[PDB]
Amino acid sequence: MDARAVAKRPRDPADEDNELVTALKAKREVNTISVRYLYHADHQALTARFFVPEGLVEFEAQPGALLIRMETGCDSPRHLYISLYLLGIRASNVSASTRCLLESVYTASAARAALQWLDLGPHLLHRRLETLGCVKTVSLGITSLLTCVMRGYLYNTLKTEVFALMIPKDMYLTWEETRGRLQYVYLIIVYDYDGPETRPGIYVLTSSIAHWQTLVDVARGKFARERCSFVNRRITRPRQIPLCTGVIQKLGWCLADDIHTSFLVHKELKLSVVRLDNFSVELGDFREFV
Amino acid sequence: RVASGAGLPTSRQTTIMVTKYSEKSPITIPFELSAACLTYLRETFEGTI
Amino acid sequence: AMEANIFCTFDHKLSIADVGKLTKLVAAVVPIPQRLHLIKHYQLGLHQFVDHTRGYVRLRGLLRNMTLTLMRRVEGNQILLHVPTHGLLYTVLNTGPVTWEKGDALCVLPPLFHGPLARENLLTLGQWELVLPWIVPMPLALEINQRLLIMGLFSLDRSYEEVKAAVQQLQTITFRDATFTIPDPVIDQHLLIDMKTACLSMSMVANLASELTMTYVRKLALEDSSMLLVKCQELLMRLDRERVSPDDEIARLSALFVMLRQLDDLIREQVVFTVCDVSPDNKSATCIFKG
């Protein structure tokens, strides 16, 4: 109410003592626990822990990898988590040499069952999946635990190191020779419909385009063949109604200039991957296109 | 509670509150007095021995 | 230094049992007609919008314009209301019948019932009542409207009981850990006017698609190099398999697009939350906000 009260500068939390300090200050009691500086006091990023079976911890142990929930019609687990790299054994987009390569590493009592759940029913994969974010600082317990980043930059605590997102080279593609100073990242499922079976076609597609109208229009050039497959499945099969050629959804954004090729290393089995650097997380709802 | 290591379930604080009640059991003692003993304790007759 | 919060004041006097009936609903989405700073309790909830002949679809649209708001704190007299800011996390009550799990794309829907419930109890002033909208996960929210629209398409013919057996299947969706019985929008065979419009909003569009496509596909087919348009006419010529002034073409095309704008309320759905951690026994869960 006072005119000086509005003349005061906006509060700085760092100048103020932490609330654990203010309580101890009145009684002047001294606890053994440190109080001068609460950690994680300054993080715009938000996180939530994801318990995972230990047969999928590999490659995820390296910081920076996409995670997606995979809903199951079984009551337990209702939602097995899936690696972006473990997802590629099913995708047709992966090279046949790379597909036989990594698959030997991911074999497990648990991970092999996840492939069976993609064959349980007709329903398309994009309905069965939901993007979660990316891991930082794996716990690596006997029951694996992960700290997924719902939003914001991936980084080590106290900002000591900024983790970079890792994306396989087989899925990555560029829409333009001229990258802008900024470009959003888009996970994009695609379905090349076919007689005996409709294969998934995963792609990672960074682009300077942001508006949904301009993005889908250029998307139809590279994917016109799968678009032709969709109507072709209709005319061949009366009383059969396949839907959705694919799905686009926002995943985040990157500084573009920081992008450069890299490779994962595990079990003496290197795997080249595109390496986005300061990938702030910005999850987006699925947006089907035909 | 007690501290525990990483990869294990923890122990969130568990405040607990309870309230005792009370029982009751009254007693009573009848006792008789002869009506003559009352009337002699009350009224006093002539001072005969 | 306190965070800004909308104030609100009930008019009717509250018994101590009533103010404690409200403190059980700390976190809770509360629609607000307009971002006014003061607000009467009559403005709270969908109850001011409650209608008889007007259908569920009218609640589906006006609720999108409502300002969702959590009840950050409850006291006497004034009641605080914390409008979410995008990108921050916000704990929310699981008032929705569906159980929540990690990462769900929650989106608000108006409350529903299937006759008497085990607990309809809520805060209740004289005549006034509160109604807290459901917070359904997104995949079910498509399943709700997909059932509600088809059920009204058969409303013209309740006379065949064999059709009712299909309506009984649509009436009870069975999501895991749930046993819903979606109420029939129809009452006494007659449709609600909102249901009659929503059915007209779609059937009129599909009818115009059957005939208007026969012209424009022809001139546009030869110019195309992708050839995908060239085979689109094949199914249209086989859509005939069963058994004009230039100004008329303009008014005919004009209705085809404007009806879709009326239909858009039932199509795309905004997501209002995405789940993170879930509390034990699923009483509530924190959810980072997302407009």
The tally of strands of chain B reads 0
Cα distance spanning the termini of chain B: 86 Å
* Quaternary organisation of the protein chains: part of a larger assembly
How many helical elements of chain B? 1
Give the biggest beta sheet of chain B: none
Largest interface: A-C, 25 and 26 residues
Which term fits the overall shape of chain B? rod-shaped
How does the major sheet of chain A shape up?
12 strands, mixed
Distance between the termini of chain A: 59 Å
Treating each run of at least 4 consecutive H or I residues as one helix, how many helices of chain A?
Answer: 7
Number of strands of chain A: 15
Estimated helix fraction of chain A: 10-25%
Strand/helix succession of chain B: H
* Molecular shape of chain A: globular
Gist of the model:
This is part of a larger assembly, with chains A (290 residues), B (49 residues) and C (291 residues). Helix content of chain B is 16%, strand content 0%. With 49 residues, chain B is mainly alpha-helical.
Report on the structure:
Chain A: Interacts with TRX2, MCP and capsid vertex component 2/CVC2. Chain A: Belongs to the herpesviridae TRX1 protein family. Chain A: This is Triplex capsid protein 1. Chain A: Keywords: Capsid protein, Host nucleus, Virion. Chain A: GO terms for molecular function: DNA binding. This is part of a larger assembly, with chains A (290 residues), B (49 residues) and C (291 residues). Chain A is α+β, with helices and mostly antiparallel strands. Chain A has helices at residues 3-7, 19-27, 96-106, 111-116, 125-128, 212-222, 224-236; strands at residues 46-52, 66-71, 79-83, 129-136, 144-152, 165-168, 172-174, 183-192, 199-200, 203-206, 246-254, 260-264, 271-276, 280-282, 287-289. In chain A, the strands form two sheets. In chain A, strands 1, 2, 3, 4, 5, 7, 8, 9, 10, 11, 14 and 15 form a twelve-stranded mixed sheet that branches. Chain A has a three-stranded antiparallel sheet with strand order 6-13-12, with no helix packed on it. In chain A, a hairpin with a 6-residue loop joins strand 8 (183-192) and strand 9 (199-200). The radius of gyration of chain A is 23 Å and the shape is globular. The relative contact order of chain A is 0.15. Chain B is mainly α and 49 residues long. Chain B is built from one helix and no strands. Chain B has one helix at 35-42. With 291 residues, chain C is mainly alpha-helical. In chain C, 35% of the residues lie in helices and 9% in strands. A three-stranded antiparallel sheet of chain C has the order 1-5-4, with no helix packed on it. A two-stranded antiparallel sheet of chain C has the order 2-3. In chain C, strand 4 (273-278) and strand 5 form a beta hairpin. The interface between A and C is medium-sized, with 25 and 26 residues.
